[PDB]
């Protein structure tokens, strides 16, 4: 199952890289680092949690921007390698207005773009250098480049003419992307 993309018609003429760069700037950097972790401000959360789930989700400390990662995710906390998110990410959904997550699934009230069949997978022993950790931490720290790089590779695996510099409408014509 190759990467599949859903997008709001709004973004049809945007490139995937343009959308990711803009969304990351709107979201900002939650500053989840030693000495700066503020529960309920920059922790986000898991479903079901508390440290593991089929989803991890977080909203901006300032804007309405949010994302949801779907897969099977595990946070090591103090277990070596400490502060590592690992497991699998199948889907990343970007947009604004995070809802749910505590007895029900996290969802975006305004889902803008969703990338599924991502096939992201990393073991605990890879630590913070694992592709799951890099991709998801980048999205909450103001750097969408790890996710853009992974999407670029997945698109080129469908056809070398496709890239993150393709527009959503281009990927729609190629059968990879679909409106809504």
Automatic annotation (TrEMBL):
It holds the Pfam family HasA. Heme b binds at residues 32, 35, 75, 128. Coiled coil: none annotated. Heme binds at residues 32, 75. Keywords: Heme, Iron, Metal-binding. InterPro entries: HasA_haem-bd (IPR010495), HasA_haem-bd_sf (IPR036912). GO terms for molecular function: metal ion binding. This is Heme acquisition protein HasAp.
């Amino acid at each position: 199952m190759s990467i599949s993309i859903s997008y709001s018609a709004t973004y049809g003429g945007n490139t995937v890289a343009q959308y990711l760069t803009d969304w990351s700037a709107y979201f900002g950097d939650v500053n989840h680092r030693p000495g700066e972790v503020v529960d309920g401000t920059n922790t986000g959360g898991f479903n079901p949690g508390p440290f593991d789930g089929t989803q991890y989700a977080i909203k901006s400390t300032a804007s309405d921007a949010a994302f949801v990662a779907d897969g099977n995710l595990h946070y090591t906390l103090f277990s070596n390698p400490s502060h590592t998110l690992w497991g699998s990410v199948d889907t990343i959904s970007l947009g604004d207005t995070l809802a749910g997550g505590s007895g029900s699934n996290y969802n975006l009230v305004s889902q803008e773009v969703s990338f599924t069949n991502l096939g992201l997978n990393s073991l605990k022993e890879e630590g913070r250098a694992g592709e799951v950790h890099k991709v998801v931490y980048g999205l909450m720290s103001g750097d969408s480049s790890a996710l853009a790089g992974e999407i670029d590779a997945l698109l080129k695996a469908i056809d070398p003419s496709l890239s993150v510099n393709s527009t959503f409408d281009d990927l729609a014509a190629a059968g990879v992307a679909h409106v809504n």
